[PDB]
Amino acid sequence: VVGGTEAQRNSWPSQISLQYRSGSSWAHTCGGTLIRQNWVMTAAHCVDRELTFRVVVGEHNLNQNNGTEQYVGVQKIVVHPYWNTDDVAAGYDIALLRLAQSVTLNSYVQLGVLPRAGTILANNSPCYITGWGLTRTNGQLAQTLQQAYLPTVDYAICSSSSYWGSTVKNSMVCAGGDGVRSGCQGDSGGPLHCLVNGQYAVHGVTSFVSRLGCNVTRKPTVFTRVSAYISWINNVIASN
Ligand code: NA
Numbered sequence: 642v643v644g645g646t647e648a649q650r651n652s653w654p655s656q657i658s659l660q661y662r663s664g665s666s667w668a669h670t671c672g673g674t675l676i677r678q679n680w681v682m683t684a685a686h687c688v689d690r691e692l693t694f695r696v697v698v699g700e701h702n703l704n705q706n707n708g709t710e711q712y713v714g715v716q717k718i719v720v721h722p723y724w725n726t727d728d729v730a731a732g733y734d735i736a737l738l739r740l741a742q743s744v745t746l747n748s749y750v751q752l753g754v755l756p757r758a759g760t761i762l763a764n765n766s767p768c769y770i771t772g773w774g775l776t777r778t779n780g781q782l783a784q785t786l787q788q789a790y791l792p793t794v795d796y797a798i799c800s801s802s803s804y805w806g807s808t809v810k811n812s813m814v815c816a817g818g819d820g821v822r823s824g825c826q827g828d829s830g831g832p833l834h835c836l837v838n839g840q841y842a843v844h845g846v847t848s849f850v851s852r853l854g855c856n857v858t859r860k861p862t863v864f865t866r867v868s869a870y871i872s873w874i875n876n877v878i879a880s881n
Pocket of ligand 1: 700701702703704705706707710
């Protein structure tokens, strides 16, 4: 997250860190959202590589013991069947991870609530992106979980020629694009939390930014629209 602020450690208890085994250690690669005690929602592109993955819930500082972490292996990966890794712009950038164990819930570990199917945010709706991704274009990962305020940019605007044009689909949410605040590499797969009727819900799964940089004016961060995938999510969980 470029232009973020440190999150309070109990603000976003559905945020997870998806990590891969790297020699004798583990490295953060992506975010995700805990949606059942044994299921995480992330981006498909995060699990394209043939790596050994684990999920960390209750994480705050990737570089220090927080006293709240639970570590759990990924047992099964179910990518959306229409995902195509060389065409992120087509959409379908979503995957579900079944965890090897069910995590224990507490003030640091909670299920993300999802929007009702079909819900579309009005332009300029208030949202936060969260993650441990790069803090500058071509920078380094955050240590502590970051948040940035990214209001939505509706389809009519986002798909206009000075924004994303044809690359943005109605199955995506755009947010930000002010040139200061954005998602960045390492935030992929994590949540966009939007405040609706008094309650934050996870409306987005972070999918892509501009090849020209993270915080680029009129290139809002693009997220998979969770509300387009409610039936898919329910169908996967019920058949696994
Ligand atoms: Na930690």
